[PDB]
Design a protein around this ligand. Structure first.
Ligand code: GLC
Length: 184
């Protein structure tokens, strides 16, 4: 199946619905009023590297001073890819904001420092392939029992607060995923 048809679940964190240049519908945030804090602070800033019709995705966020996450129902077995979108709209030095990302307890991104990787007010995406088959989740070579729901967690450490800007899951493999342009 082609791209928009292959997307099973997608969220614009801290914001309203938005359809991107690829036809992907990022839904209004289901955690509004529930857990964490929404911020539109980035709406004052141009976002580098992102396509300009879609910068609203990176200008809105959900963050928190304690660990928080999203629960995702997955109906059918198959191969999937999770895409996580971020931007640093406040700090402009390394080791100011740093956090881990976990999937059903497995640490899939260790010590994420958005500024260190891309700079200030600039798009950064993480791309995480996975498989759900024979009652198991498989990610980065580790395997555990899958019950029907995936728990995506952003973990509080010592350096400022965990955050996320947007996220989506598509059926397919990594070669099917649109990539951001190369960046120094
Ligand atoms: O709202 C502006 C900023 O407030 C806090 O510093 C948050 O930890 C940060 O993620 C956010 O970008």
């Amino acid at each position: 199946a082609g791209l928009p048809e292959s997307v099973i679940w997608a969220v614009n964190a801290g914001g309203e619905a938005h359809v991107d240049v690829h036809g992907i519908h990022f839904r209004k945030d289901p955690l509004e009023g529930r857990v964490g804090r929404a911020s539109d602070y980035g709406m004052k800033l141009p976002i580098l590297r992102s396509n300009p019709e879609d910068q609203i995705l990176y200008q809105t966020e959900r963050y928190n001073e304690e660990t928080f996450g999203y629960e995702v129902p997955i109906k059918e077995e198959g191969d999937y890819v999770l895409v996580l979108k971020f931007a640093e709209v406040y700090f402009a030095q390394s080791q100011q904001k740093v956090f881990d990302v976990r999937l059903n307890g497995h640490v899939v991104v260790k010590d994420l420092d958005i500024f260190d990787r891309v700079g200030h007010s600039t798009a950064h995406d993480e791309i995480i392939p996975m498989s759900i088959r024979k009652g198991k989740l498989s990610v980065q070579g580790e395997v555990s029992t899958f019950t029907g729901k995936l728990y995506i967690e952003f973990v509080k450490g010592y350096y400022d607060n965990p955050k996320v800007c947007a996220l989506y899951i598509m059926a397919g493999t990594v070669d099917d995923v649109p990539k951001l342009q190369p960046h120094p």
